[PDB]
Design a protein around this ligand. Structure first.
Ligand SMILES: [Cl-]
Ligand SMILES: [Cl-]
Ligand SMILES: [Cl-]
Ligand SMILES: [Cl-]
Lengths: 135, 138
């Protein structure tokens, strides 16, 4: 029960991401959601999270394929591993000029699911690899 | 299916218990001969020989304990995710890092695993390397 409700939540979060439906993503998150950026800071709350998504989309556009979701029996901890496919479309800081450069690389994330909502998103990938691909 | 999950989570939990004991031989026993090891922000290393040398190189510079270990699996029992908090000490300088002087660090980490017939065939380890470097350099 709880394991299904937890993995379902995370799957819906990722479907929303893959559609570009940021509002729908945000609806799954607690007001004080903790978001650990890869090789970056912890940011608290939906406002920061919305800003993050908007900022990412200003330069990149991605989808997550081959999402494999794992959970505990309590349905309180979820892992997801994925393959991100994307394009670097509009030049970003600390990178060469955008050219439609494509990237494909694995990533993964972990989630706390509490009181019917995602209370933490901790994201990981090999940033050195990503750098190398987008040049 | 419940049992597939139990098999996968049990293997991975045992692997981490072994790590906390410093039981490298047990860790190696849980790995397949074709194991792929993805170092965080680093290269892939293939095979048990490489994994044995990796454990040796790491023990030479760092002392670590994993706490708050949480292991999760898919229903097929073929993929496992794990999270933990490492509590560590940098005691002997490591190729390409600041000088070691006994600096402590405490930070989360996570890993993903492929499990095939009761052996680990992939260990993909992640953590915030920037945060780790900031702690050991503080
Ligand atoms: Cl991120
Ligand atoms: Cl690593
Ligand atoms: Cl990595
Ligand atoms: Cl990170």
């Amino acid at each position: 029960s709880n394991r299904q409700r937890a993995t379902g939540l995370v799957q819906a979060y990722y479907e929303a991401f893959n559609r570009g439906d940021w509002d729908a993503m945000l609806a799954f998150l607690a007001e004080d959601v903790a978001h650990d950026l890869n090789q970056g800071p912890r940011e608290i709350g939906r406002a920061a999270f919305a800003s993050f998504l908007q900022r990412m989309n200003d330069s990149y556009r991605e989808q997550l394929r081959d999402i494999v979701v794992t959970a505990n029996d309590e349905g309180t901890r979820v892992g997801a591993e994925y393959v991100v496919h994307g394009v670097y479309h509009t030049t970003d800081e600390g990178l060469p000029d955008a050219n439609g450069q494509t990237y494909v690389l694995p990533g993964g994330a972990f989630f706390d699911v509490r009181d019917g909502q995602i209370t933490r998103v901790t994201n990981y990938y090999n940033l050195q690899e990503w750098i190398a691909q987008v040049s």
